[PDB]
Amino acid sequence: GSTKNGRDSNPKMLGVKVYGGQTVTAGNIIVRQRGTEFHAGANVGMGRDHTLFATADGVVKFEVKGQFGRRYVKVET
Amino acid sequence: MKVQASVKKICGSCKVIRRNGVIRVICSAEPRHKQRQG
Amino acid sequence: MKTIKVTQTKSSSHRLKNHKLCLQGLGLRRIGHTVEVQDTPSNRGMINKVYYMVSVEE
Amino acid sequence: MKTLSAKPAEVQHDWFVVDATGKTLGRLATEIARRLRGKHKTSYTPHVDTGDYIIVINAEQVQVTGNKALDKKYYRHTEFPGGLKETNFEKLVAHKPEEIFERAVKGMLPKGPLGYAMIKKMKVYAGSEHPHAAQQPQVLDI
């Protein structure tokens, strides 16, 4: 006979692009994510596809905050 | 005489001996309990 | 500043790339070759990574 | 050319007689092979024969350990189909001890014309007497 499987989708290259302690410029993308695994803090904007980008020049920092305990990424000038 | 890899005592009239590198079971009263090898 | 002698005791032909680079950074170039190096953590790391094919005289 | 090889013409072969009563076959055969090849002389040359003549007496008293006397098998094949013939140490020592010593020594000697020539210098006899009184052999304990 034959098999009904044998299909897959092309890769999407998701994940973190700039790690904590690094330097960024305004407009640099920091996180590529399907959902909001990370949220935006100061000087970080969110795109329509949930991408996180930097709106200011500085140093990236990750943190855990809030009652929900969700993770935030921000830029320090 | 029964030749088998597993030879064991059957009754109290049996005896296990080793003759020239071969294990044997010999029974006094019963001549059918004779076992060889194993 | 103290110094330490290091001698290569085995071949490096079929070892890992980082291990060969550690030999190069220490300055060893062939079996039996001995060098004098400064006693610092930076050099000690390279020596420890290739401990199995070197001899250290303190 | 400062290193020199022995000259066959200048070689001297000395005669010795050995008694095999009570000794172990292989440990005797090793020494016999050494002396036949000439490893015991400072003039030893691989391509020259510098050994000594070795007579063996009381060859049928040679001994083996363990159960080898019964369980050591000698084979020989006639080139005809199915022609494999077998014997054991006790029968062979009773019948032809010379063959026992010949096998033991030829196994330990080199294989070639030089080896064949070297093995000619061994004389084996089952009795206590040998016919080589003229050569005046000396007693050697090995």
């Binding site: 006979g1 034959s2 098999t3 499987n5 | - | - | -």
Partner: protein
Amino acid sequence: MLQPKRTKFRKVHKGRNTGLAHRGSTVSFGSIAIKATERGRMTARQIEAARRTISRRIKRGGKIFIRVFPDKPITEKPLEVRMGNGKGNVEYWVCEIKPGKILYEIEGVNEDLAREAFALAAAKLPFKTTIVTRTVM
């Protein structure tokens, strides 16, 4: 023949059997237990045969607790077939056995009868066994 009533997926990967059994090595539902000492695979038919032997020989004078359940399907290609063309079909179910894994416990019968029955059962298993008893600590 024990088999899961329902399953999420029909076919599973082969995997590898390693490690020891730190869980399931303690007698907890009875007095006297039979425990494996090496690793392997135990089939449902083997489980049933061992249980039947033990029950027959103890004459249903106590309670047997079974602590192995086959939940891993196994597939084989039918026959006369070349390599490729997809995975095979399920033919039987098995359970992974690690050293220290308890297989059967007996409660309510005497030590001699229980041990002798376990001796009968061991002749059908594909791996070595040993006998243990309840203990305080």
